[PDB]
Scaffold this active site. Structure first.
Site, PDB file in Angstrom:
ATOM      1  N   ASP A  56       0.801  -1.220   0.000  1.00  0.00           N
ATOM      2  CA  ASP A  56       0.000   0.000   0.000  1.00  0.00           C
ATOM      3  C   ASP A  56       0.836   1.274   0.000  1.00  0.00           C
ATOM      4  O   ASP A  56       0.491   2.226  -0.709  1.00  0.00           O
ATOM      5  CB  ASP A  56      -0.944   0.010   1.197  1.00  0.00           C
ATOM      6  CG  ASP A  56      -2.071   0.997   1.027  1.00  0.00           C
ATOM      7  OD1 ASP A  56      -1.921   1.929   0.213  1.00  0.00           O
ATOM      8  OD2 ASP A  56      -3.111   0.838   1.695  1.00  0.00           O
ATOM      9  N   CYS A 104       7.909  -1.821  -3.272  1.00  0.00           N
ATOM     10  CA  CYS A 104       8.096  -3.177  -2.759  1.00  0.00           C
ATOM     11  C   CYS A 104       8.423  -3.103  -1.267  1.00  0.00           C
ATOM     12  O   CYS A 104       9.553  -3.314  -0.822  1.00  0.00           O
ATOM     13  CB  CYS A 104       9.187  -3.888  -3.546  1.00  0.00           C
ATOM     14  SG  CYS A 104       9.173  -3.494  -5.310  1.00  0.00           S
ATOM     15  N   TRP A 155       3.725   7.012  -5.286  1.00  0.00           N
ATOM     16  CA  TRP A 155       3.153   7.311  -6.589  1.00  0.00           C
ATOM     17  C   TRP A 155       2.981   8.817  -6.752  1.00  0.00           C
ATOM     18  O   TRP A 155       3.278   9.601  -5.849  1.00  0.00           O
ATOM     19  CB  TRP A 155       1.796   6.622  -6.754  1.00  0.00           C
ATOM     20  CG  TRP A 155       1.848   5.182  -7.166  1.00  0.00           C
ATOM     21  CD1 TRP A 155       2.934   4.487  -7.604  1.00  0.00           C
ATOM     22  CD2 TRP A 155       0.750   4.262  -7.181  1.00  0.00           C
ATOM     23  NE1 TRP A 155       2.583   3.191  -7.890  1.00  0.00           N
ATOM     24  CE2 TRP A 155       1.246   3.028  -7.639  1.00  0.00           C
ATOM     25  CE3 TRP A 155      -0.603   4.363  -6.851  1.00  0.00           C
ATOM     26  CZ2 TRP A 155       0.434   1.901  -7.775  1.00  0.00           C
ATOM     27  CZ3 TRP A 155      -1.406   3.244  -6.986  1.00  0.00           C
ATOM     28  CH2 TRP A 155      -0.886   2.031  -7.445  1.00  0.00           C
ATOM     29  N   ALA A 208      -0.821   5.158   1.477  1.00  0.00           N
ATOM     30  CA  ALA A 208      -2.251   5.286   1.189  1.00  0.00           C
ATOM     31  C   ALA A 208      -2.546   6.463   0.264  1.00  0.00           C
ATOM     32  O   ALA A 208      -3.297   7.373   0.613  1.00  0.00           O
ATOM     33  CB  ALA A 208      -3.059   5.406   2.479  1.00  0.00           C
TER      34      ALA A 208
END
Ligand SMILES: [Zn+2]
Ligand SMILES: [Zn+2]
Ligand SMILES: [Zn+2]
Ligand SMILES: [Zn+2]
Ligand SMILES: [Zn+2]
Ligand SMILES: [Zn+2]
Lengths: 440, 108, 440, 106, 107, 106
Positions: free
Chosen positions: C169, C238, C421, C172
């Site tokens: 995750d 990862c 991200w 979040a």
């Protein structure tokens, strides 16, 4: 040495009343009533009580006994937020023989200021002792000083912005509060030599603060060149290394050379005779100080201090003296719905507190640790933890995330926040200024 | 002649008119003042143990040539409360009496 | 080597056209046109160019020669934000004898991609080379698969909250974006083993994320007990310990055993035949991977990737592959007034930048030291300084002070932000979902 | 005989009854032993065959064997159906390399 | 070794790896051998064992075996998946009956 | 050599500079304190170049009075109405010296 024991024996024999001897040191010259217990207090111990009634160790527990402000070997109270101290001699002489052993044995012990019961042998507690202690700090040496001037209010139309001068600025709390109140600012000249604080102020206030560096270099020509001022404020945290050591002072040193520069610059900046424009000032220092220094400061400034404690509108124990002539600064301190008076409202999500007010903090993180065993003040997943910086910021009244700049290590933030003033206290003092200077 | 003194006082705060108390609350008195020129002034300070009276506020001391508060700036020079500077000429002990001398410095 | 020289000499003698030889390695089996320069390209060189056209070393400069994607000794371009490479052999053969030495003399030098001129001997630059390079990444190997099924729009009345399952995750980002868009969330089950990110999510999202530990322990029975899902999203970082060491990554290794877990769990969670409820998924990986791995992933998932770069809607260079079946993820990537497309809009007050986009920031600390000589990308008081965390947060699109939790050292904050991200890309991808599930 | 000390890390289904490990070597299932419903054994042998075309999982169709094996720690192979398999022996016979996998109960 | 002309007409799958002949007698497929992609043969054995609860096609799941077997002329069998199989032989030894069926190439 | 020429009116032209009615300048050189209260000041007659006049504001605070005036019985009345007693007035080597002393108030 036998005088105190003889007097105690006589009172227990019902020959003298306990309101006619000095319980602390055992002398027959009684001039004042003890503010906590029932008894008399002599002139010599009044000064020592004034000095040592508000001194605490690095661990948060008291330094000196409660009755005699001295002591060699001590007990200690157990209830948190009541970290007072008692020494062996007083307990045995006054409460009774052998009571100290029982107090040591019981776990946890509640001292005589917690217990619902009001009498323990000769030691008897008063009913309004909080108000008595608060009023006991109104025994200043001289009183002839006249009331300060009252400049008539200016009509709203003629009001004009404010010009400020700050000494030992810190992280610019005064400008923050002045922005909060809604008062226009035309100048704000600051003196400071701390790099972290300079960066914090520069980033936060969009370069509105002019820095002039060290204070031992400012001349009267600079004061005359930088224009008339309308507010001079100074005091701690004394960033410039004018006072040599935090601890080597003892109780006496540093204050003189801190006050000298403030007096000099204030003398330079004051309006000359024949000019009637408004002028205000303010000076601040700690409670734990010598009597002679306080007397001299009051003489030279010609005013007496007003003690203000931040625990009434915040979640920390912080007491200070404030010299000044701002309008009506002696009025009672009241809270508003916007305050956070408990430590449970300052923690993040998922954490549980252990006290009601945070005891003490110093430069090093070990100060935040609590108890002789060094336990932490917060609970998290049934495991103790120390306060985060984002929680201290709420504790001191600053906006959250105020001190996140310039990649400072997370240890320097603790010092920056610990050394600073308290916003809700300063707002109390500055509130009346709106009657004389324009508003946004 | 006189034996030199090395432990300089740190302060001189006005207690009464013509009495000054250093950091250890010892009393010094200005006994004589010399006037060379309009911008050159000298004051002689001597230490006498005397019974002190009630202290005075600056407004009751009144105007005077001497300042109200000296202080030992680093590198051995005394600044006054008027932002001027003073220089220590000698500091000697004679037959148990200690004397101090201060000389004003021009304005630059 | 002599072969390439011989064909180059022949084309110089005007016996052959430069569009009939593979300029990269000299083979006569031409199959494609070079995306950048004018000439031919063979199959092996095509595969190598797909592999090594986006690999950058620690300092931020290109790893392999632009033409032959190999090389032993390379020059360096001078213009910032054009950190490219040219090996000596290519410059000497294709531009002219001794040209590389002349370029070595000059200081600074602009490579052939910056120069206003389009021809240098034989090496000539194509005018539509940006679009051609973009299109060269749609030569998907082998099969062309069938179109995905379109799930009919659900009427607004019947829409119901979304249920999510996240693997690896991070901090979040998916829940943050889903909250931004305005879509109700019923579940959000996360798997993660890093403590810092766990704390950040727990504090920031008020305990809405259910953590279930590592991924190698999840069973099929859990995937049933935890209820039906409607969105399975996975990919890097990862966080788990199934890779641990890049020393055994190379170009083909390390990245082959995360797809195993993602495929297993996706196979478990997929609706069975006869249940026609909407179902979606998404998988992410870097551009610089082996060709065989890409072929296999596309086979097993039965789709081809869509390359999306964040430099079009942000201030960083980050290129990724995205497998999925979300509605219309191939549509063009547009910007909005809410974006900050330059590095001058991400700095605090009083600082000056040196580039237009952040060259390359990764988990490695030195990645912030961009440019040759390991430049610090910011000027402040005519001095070199590195980006602060509060500036990286803006660079990556996060809200300011998002990662300020739990007394983390600033290095940990840097790593957390580096691994994550990009918010605007994920918002672009998720935007269409509003037509299928309820809205706040 | 000759025991082999190392094992393949993966077995990806290239065609029906062909499997390629991480180094693109082809292993084929030659025989399957069926003791009981919960017990299955597969014999894999390494042959160098001319590979045809790759197939999607849909075109491979239903089959007893999984589509992908992975070497979990402790020398146990987990299949894409979430079951577990155990390595019995791994030998070499005059160049012929053989492997055996035995299913485990759930 | 006895050569046996006993020939099951129809075999139905009562459970996975369990088949019942029209005479309700169970047949157990033991091994599968693969020589070529189109050459897959399976050994069937007659047994007398306790039959369990019936399994639906969904419960049986994907399997290389067909679900239905039916007799075809010329010693052949037609499977559920339309494939054709050949009877390699059927012998009885030591009271144990063994039958081997092999897959035929499609055309 | 005692001199009976007592100045009548002394005005402060500049700090530490006083002009007699004869426009002759007198320079106060030293001020001496006895115990803590009594003040004595020595005045000397000289002929020096006078500078620009200084207003009372420019003179600033000073232990000296700004005006002196002769009073009967060998006394002088200062600006603040205090009385000063002459100690002696002598001439040595052509230089005239005058010493004034402050009388206690009553
Ligand atoms: Zn006492
Ligand atoms: Zn005590
Ligand atoms: Zn207590
Ligand atoms: Zn090639
Ligand atoms: Zn090259
Ligand atoms: Zn370039």
């Amino acid at each position: 040495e036998r005088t105190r024991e003889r007097l105690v024996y006589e009172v227990r024999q019902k020959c003298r009343n306990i309101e006619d001897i000095c319980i602390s040191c055992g002398s027959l010259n009684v001039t004042l009533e003890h503010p906590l217990f029932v008894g008399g207090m002599c002139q010599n111990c009044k000064n020592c009580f004034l000095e040592c009634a508000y001194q605490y160790d690095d661990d948060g527990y008291q330094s000196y006994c409660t009755i005699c402000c001295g002591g060699r070997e001590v007990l200690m109270c157990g209830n948190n937020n009541c970290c007072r101290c008692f020494c062996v001699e007083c307990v045995d002489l006054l409460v009774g023989p052998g009571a100290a052993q029982a107090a040591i044995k019981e776990d946890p012990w509640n001292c005589y200021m917690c217990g619902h019961k009001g009498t323990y042998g000769l030691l008897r507690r008063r009913e309004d002792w909080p108000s008595r202690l608060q009023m006991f700090f109104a025994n200043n040496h001289d009183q002839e000083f006249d009331p300060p001037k009252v400049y008539p209010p200016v009509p709203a139309e003629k009001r004009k912005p404010i010009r400020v001068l700050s000494l030992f600025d810190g992280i610019a709390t005064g400008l923050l509060v002045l922005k909060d109140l809604g008062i226009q600012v035309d100048r704000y000249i600051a003196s400071e030599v701390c790099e972290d604080s300079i960066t914090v102020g520069m980033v936060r206030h969009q370069g509105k603060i002019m820095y002039v560096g060290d204070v031992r270099s400012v001349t009267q020509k600079h004061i005359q060149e930088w224009g008339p001022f309308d507010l001079v404020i100074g005091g701690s945290p004394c960033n410039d290394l004018s006072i040599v050591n935090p601890a080597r002072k003892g109780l006496y040193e540093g204050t003189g050379r801190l006050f000298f520069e403030f007096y000099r610059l204030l003398h330079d900046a004051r309006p000359k005779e024949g000019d009637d424009r408004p002028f205000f000032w303010l000076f601040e220092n700690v409670v734990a100080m010598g009597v002679s220094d306080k007397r001299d400061i009051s003489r030279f400034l010609e005013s007496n201090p007003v003690m203000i404690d931040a625990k009434e509108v915040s979640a920390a124990h912080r007491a200070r003296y404030f010299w000044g002539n701002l309008p009506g600064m002696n009025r009672p301190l009241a809270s508003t719905v916007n305050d956070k008076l408990e430590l449970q409202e300052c923690l993040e999500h998922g954490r549980i507190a252990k006290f009601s007010k945070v005891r003490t903090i110093t430069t090093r993180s070990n100060s935040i640790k609590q108890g002789k065993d060094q336990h932490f003040p917060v609970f998290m997943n049934e495991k103790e933890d120390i306060l985060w910086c984002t929680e201290m910021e709420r504790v001191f009244g600053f906006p959250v995330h105020y001190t996140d700049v310039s990649n400072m290590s997370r240890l320097a933030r603790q010092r920056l926040l610990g050394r600073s003033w308290s916003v809700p206290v300063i707002r109390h003092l500055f509130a009346p200024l709106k009657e004389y200077f324009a508003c946004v | 002649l006189g034996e030199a003194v090395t432990d300089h006082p740190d302060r001189l705060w006005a207690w009464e008119k013509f009495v000054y108390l250093d950091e250890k609350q010892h009393a010094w008195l200005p006994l004589t003042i010399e006037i060379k020129d309009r911008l050159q002034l000298r004051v002689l300070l001597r230490r006498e143990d005397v019974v002190l009276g009630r202290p005075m506020t600056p407004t009751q001391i009144g105007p005077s040539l001497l300042p109200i508060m000296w202080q030992l700036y680093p590198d051995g020079r005394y600044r006054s409360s008027d932002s001027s500077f003073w220089r220590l000429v000698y500091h000697i002990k004679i037959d148990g009496v200690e004397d101090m001398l201060l000389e004003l410095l021009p304005d630059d």
